[PDB]
Amino acid sequence: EVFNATRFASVYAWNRTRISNCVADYSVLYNFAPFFAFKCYGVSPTKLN
C-alpha cells in the first residue's frame, strides 16, 4: 500500500505513515521497484531481513 499509492504528496507536505505489528520481508519491496537509488546508511540492504 505504501509503494502502490496514487498521490504521493509533495515534499512541502510529506505524507507520513507508520508500520507496526508486522513481519517485514523486503523481497516484495524489491519486486515493485526498478530501483534507481538504494543508498542505505543506518543498515545494510543485503543484511536487512
Ligand X SMILES: *[C@@H]1O[C@H](CO)[C@@H](O[C@@H]2O[C@H](CO)[C@@H](O)[C@H](O)[C@@H]2O)[C@H](O)[C@H]1NC(C)=O
Ligand Y SMILES: *[C@@H]1O[C@H](CO)[C@@H](O)[C@H](O)[C@H]1NC(C)=O
Q: Which does 42 bind (CB under 5 to 8 A by kind): ligand X, ligand Y, another protein, none?
A: none
Of 32, 34, 35, 1, give the one whose Cα is nearest residue 19. Answer: 1
Enumerate residues 15-34 that contact another protein by CB under 8 A: 31, 34
Cell digits of residue 23: 513481519
Determine if residue 21 is left, alpha or beta; phi over 0 gives left, psi from -120 to 50 gives alpha, anything else beta: left
Q: Restricting to residues 5-34, which ones interact with ligand X according to CB under 6 A?
A: 5, 15-17
Query: Which of ligand Y, ligand X, another protein, none does residue 37 bind (CB under 5 to 8 Å by kind)?
Result: another protein
Question: Could you tell me the three cell numbers for 19?
Answer: 508500520
Interacting residues with ligand Y (CB under 6 A): 3-4, 32
